[PDB]
Structure 1
């Protein structure tokens, strides 16, 4: 079941032969499919559709060769440390809760900037949704992604320490190496290969048909165009010089929005698809009223402590996961820095580490708390929308963080972690901490959870199946319009969702092709 995994190899940019600047007006015209957003779901979706049909993929960012630190594990922090000048692969934002965050702006989407952790969805997820999944095809599609960009990670000293700690702390059983989201401790896959080269969703464009697939970069899609039976017919997009362009679908073809949790509700709202009284209050003509566009937007909380060992530890990428139903835990080890990677810590005024440190982390599942995306500009898609997640508004989320923080306490008490204490005392105050240490009444853990929350970066929702979309990802009430990306589900598929959303892009592409045949 692992014969098919990818090998160590250079990042494959062969697909650049059909990538063009959106300034090229000859890209304007009619296609069978237009995919908006060249990201985690959008790239394998476009590649899949191009097996049989003419596809235009539109991405607002540029190509990853322009930002070489996106292409190595060693460059992960660099892209977050880099200032956001409107063109960089990392776009910075702050939720209305006050928590710093980022999204991608690059061909390949968030797989070009993320921490590389690869996992398949919790196998119970499919029946939880109630969608009639073709489960055999789901698994074939995971293998199609994994053959291109997923490896079995080599050993990393810190990842092995934390795995021994998770097991000693009772996060059982030992699952060895496995891609599956199951209770226990395991080594999972990575989209960094064993030479440190990042592999990503853009490489899945290499599986497209180069005679049928066209990609426009620095293409800012501003509006979905509709028929004068309401149908999507095309898009308006602007190029890096600011000039406008139009592209259309033809016949039985379709527009699919794959612009992410933030970008997809924004574009739907700008296009008149959304809550009637809200759009009317902005004087946006309503094309399709739906009270849920931009509603039910979720961000799984990240809580953490940081330890500063008295001897240097080796930096690592996350590969070893400790999974329970009520918390998902990992640890990153890092070099010190004097410029913070934006959103690693929730505020810019966080203390800076002067030596190597271990960031020890727990994730709240769900979450049950949710907020919304609303427009900041009623016209300009380059102006980021407002986004609020309402962290810990739901008491179940807070209770689950308390459980995870207690388990992090257990982890710090293991023999495995003992050699990284600065003082050989009995308690966990023998560690040196960067930032706030763990407090053991439930009230002190609740305060810690609330005060020190950060984004796990795994936000989702805003165009949910069952609210905005049907079980085939069609926008209800509109022909020839679908949404495929992380805006579509209200809960996580697992601890690390890129593997699910990579699969989903191709999977829905195959469903489109089958429906059409």
Structure 2
């Protein structure tokens, strides 16, 4: 783990605005998306080769509130002017959501919860994992931006509630995703300073790594030398001037534009379903039926309580893990401006006092949808995405069990002091929004609750799966010098909170590439 310190912006020495980058550059590797996986990947590759990372968003310094824990809600509340770090979108299901648009990616605007992936998921994932390397990489990330949190009153209350409610065993402080209750790590340090993926750029070689911000990558360039190969990308700066960045022999273009951005860029570049691309007059580079398919978004269901006695805002650190659902509680100050994506719609009552948000994330999820373009030419126009929440009934069953567990928490001695009236069961609380069914044994009522109150846990992933679009080495099948490394590569969430795994993934693949270049050297 790391030690509390200011956000490290040393990498600014090699950060440039796209308008200042050359019109035509040559590198060993070009990384699209300076996000959660993108930054550590770029830093690792720069240890030996010339790397250029292209990020559409601004430097974190352009939006100071992304650098503190008490700025979390603020960023979500900010109006989307097309340049802000929080990009708003609404799935076809009608659920509000957001994604990062800034150097550091979504790790720069998230809730800071850090967890290592469930150790049992690597086995039949389609990737032959080097577990020694996986752990060395987690350590590499953790020693740079992960911290053991301060004790916090509300989180402690939540911990007592989980333990009283049978979420066992107790793991004390642990980073591992395991069944039971525990206090995990956070990317927010003990002074509330947010640390993120961008700082992993500092681990790279300052003479080999170059970062371009305000760089909108619109298309991947291909050629046959002699086989189909990615040769670079076209990106545009704030002046509307297009640039080109090419990769040299043995080099590669790696797309780390995220669950939403990666499939979008591939489609715009002619890599996707042939009939679909043709319907939009997009030249087909390679028919790839699964690009944009298998998009998953774990549903979030919750209960907001308004204690009669004020509680203090806290960062989530206490996790109550079950096999089918993951839970936690977020305490916060009241708002009069809605944080987009926090509640499912803009028409949700706002809290005028301090409140606690008990959240439940369904594992998986088994349900999935797809991503389609909204513009056949403009990469700045958000793609259409549908997740089909609860289309798979097993997900619904898990939501029911999960909300019943929340009901248990609400019925504990631990939460009694936060009720307005001493009533039986889950009754007695001042609830903001949709309350739980009073009868904890009414499954049908819980199913309706699950469906009508659903929101996004913001941990969407998939869209460019290993075994569907990519091979075990994250290469886009059928195309040379092209890989994908970010949250779009797997169908299910790796843990209650995925940033740890995606951060690790970036460097992991980076190391695999260096090992590959060593053997072929």
Question: What TM-score does the superposition give when structure 1 sets the normalisation length?
Answer: 0.99
1:428 counterpart residue number: 426
Q: What is the CA–CA distance in structure 2 between the aligned matches of 1:401 and 1:427, rounded to whole Å?
A: 20
SS in 2 for 1:344: coil
Asked if structure 1 preserves the Cα contact closer than 8 Å seen for 2:155 and 2:316, the reply is: yes
Q: Give distance in 1, aligned partners of 2:191 and 2:21.
A: 40
Secondary structure of 2:157's match? helix
Which residue is 1:259 aligned to?
Answer: 257
SS of 2:212's equivalent in the other structure is strand
Structure 1 residue 130: Cα displacement:
3.9
1:207 to 2:203 alignment: yes
Give the match for residue 54 of structure 1.
Answer: 50
Please give the alpha-carbon distance, in whole angstroms, between the structure 2 residues aligned to 1:163 and 1:254: 46
Distance (Å, rounded) in 2 between the aligned partners of 1:259 and 1:488: 12
From 322, 325, 349, the equivalent of 1:324 is 322
After superposition, the CA RMSD in angstroms is 0.7
Residue 132 of structure 1 and its aligned partner are, at CA, apart by: 1.0
- How far does the alpha carbon of each residue in 1:279-323 deviate from its partner, in whole angstroms, 9 at most, with x for none? 111111110101100000000000001000000001001000000
User: Cα gap change, 1:249/1:321 in structure 2, threshold over 3 Å: closer, same or farther?
Assistant: same
**2:352 & 2:54 partners in 1: Cα distance?**
42
**Of 400, 406, 409, the match for 1:408:** 406
* 1:246-287 CA-partner distances (Å, limit 9, x unpaired): 010000000000000000000000000000111111111110
Q: Secondary structure at the match of 1:226?
A: strand
Name the counterpart of 2:482. 481
Structure 2, unaligned runs of 5 or more: none
Q: Is 2:271–2:288's contact at 8 Å kept on the other side of the alignment? A: yes
Distance across 2 between alignment mates of 1:235 and 1:39: 17
Deviation, 1:31, is 0.4
Match of 1:12 among 8, 12, 16: 8
Q: CA deviation at 1:104?
A: 0.4
**Preserved CA contact (<8 Å) 2:306 2:356:** yes
Give the unaligned 5+ runs of structure 1: none
Distance 2:126 2:167 in 1: 30
- The answer to whether residue 355 in structure 2 is matched with residue 369 in structure 1 is no
The residue number in structure 2 matching 1:311 is: 309
1:502 aligns to what SS in structure 2?
helix
1:160 corresponds in structure 2 to: 156
**Take 2:127 and 2:477, find their aligned partners in 1: how far apart are those partners?**
15
Give the superposition deviation at 1:429. Answer: 1.5
Separation (CA, whole Å) in 1 of partners of 2:425 and 2:56: 51
Q: Cα offset for 1:516? A: 1.2
Partner Cα separation in structure 2 for residue 436 and residue 390 of structure 1: 21
Aligned-pair CA distance for 1:128:
3.0
Alignment match, 2:292? 294
How many Å apart are 1:54 and its aligned residue?
A: 0.2
* TM-aligned CA deviation for residue 214 of structure 1: 0.4
SS in 1 for 2:6: coil
SS across alignment from 1:347: coil
Cα 1:186–1:27 shift into 2, 3 Å: farther
**Structure 2 residue aligned with 1:67:** 63
Partner of 2:510: helix, strand, or coil? helix
CA-CA distance at 1:28 after TM superposition: 2.8
Partner Cα separation in structure 2 for residue 503 and residue 288 of structure 1: 30
2:351 counterpart of 1:350: no
CA distance in 1, matches of 2:124, 2:163: 29
Tell me the equivalent position of 1:465.
Answer: 466
Mapped to 2, the partners of 1:29 and 1:146 lie a distance apart of 33
Which is worse superposed, 69-78 or 436-445? Answer: 436-445
Structure 2 length-normalised TM = 0.98
Q: 2:27 aligned with 1:31, yes or no?
A: yes
Structure 1 residue 425: deviation in Å?
2.3
> Aligned partners of 2:365 and 2:152: how far apart in 1?
31
